[PDB]
Design a protein around this ligand. Sequence first.
Ligand SMILES: [Mg+2]
Lengths: 114, 134
Amino acid sequence: ARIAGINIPDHKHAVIALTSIYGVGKTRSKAILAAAGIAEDVKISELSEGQIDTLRDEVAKFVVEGDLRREISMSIKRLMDLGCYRGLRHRRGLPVRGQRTKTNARTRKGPRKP
Amino acid sequence: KLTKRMRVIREKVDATKQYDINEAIALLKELATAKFVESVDVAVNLGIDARKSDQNVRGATVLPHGTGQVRYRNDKNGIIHTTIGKVDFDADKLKENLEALLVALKKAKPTQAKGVYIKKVSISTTMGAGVAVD
RNA sequence: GGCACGUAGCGCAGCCUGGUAGCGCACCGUCAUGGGGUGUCGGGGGUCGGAGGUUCAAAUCCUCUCGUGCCGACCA
RNA sequence: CCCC
RNA sequence: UGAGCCUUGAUGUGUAGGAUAGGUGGGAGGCUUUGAAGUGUGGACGCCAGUCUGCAUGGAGCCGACCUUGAAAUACCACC
Ligand SMILES: [Mg+2]
């Protein structure tokens, strides 16, 4: 409801909230609840802050949204300065999850212009 | 269609006979038929075409006896609604009030008037049949 | 002065009869074919000639102007 | 509707 | 047989939102037995959604303000 200062994953299980968090998904939610000592069957609107601050600290160890995109941009700067084939593919503004682009890359290459 | 209230008031007047100012304050006693201080509305039917932005009115008139500084603005079709007071506000003094109102409108006469400035003055009652004077 | 037209590239409704630019053609790409046409299907294409006001809103109200037209007037 |  | 015109009849789904509400525009008492609200129906319109009125029974109660609405009531009155 208040972890990260910005996100309000209200009405979400102790782990569903962490999965809905920006920065981490399925596994780090469980890792956090395990390293902090909480169950994963109750929403966040029942837990007091004496534990929410601990969850906040426990998540403050990995990269966060404010630094997630920064690390991503750093990798992108590395690519663009290297000029590698991947850097060129990225600088041409094309979809990004893999290798194949010719006839099925429409998902992030958008629809057809002509 | 109605009760003994509205029919007598509407037959105590005449729509085709445009009364004068002096006789205008002669029947408001019978036209005032509310158990309070009922007002009397006034309408100035004007003789211009207000469809142009050039022909708007705006001002404030001083009531010579109060109701006293009342604002006014014209209409788009040429019928401006204003008021003078109530029916028991010394009917004889209602004519004196009317006198001070129209003298400020003839003075406030805009310059872009096309055709006749004024057409009619309907001194109508709030709970009865109105009257139309020149 | 007096009135009648400007709407995608073309011709048009809407009109220059209020609330929310559409019609056909033209063009592009599929489908219908054994192959085509016609056809559907979908998509680009315009802002209402220009400007200004009335409007909870204009295009569909009012003023002026632009271009093009018919009528009419016009004895430095 | 036309054509092979 | 067109046009004009006094009078009256009568108007005007936007959406919104109690609601076929044209601008204004002043405005709380109209409303009532020269014979209620509820109902009987016929009629007019109808974007038929609702306005709508004849003689009624019912037979004397409803409503403006009240409330969110582009706007307010269409209590009455206002000239179109
Ligand atoms: Mg690509």
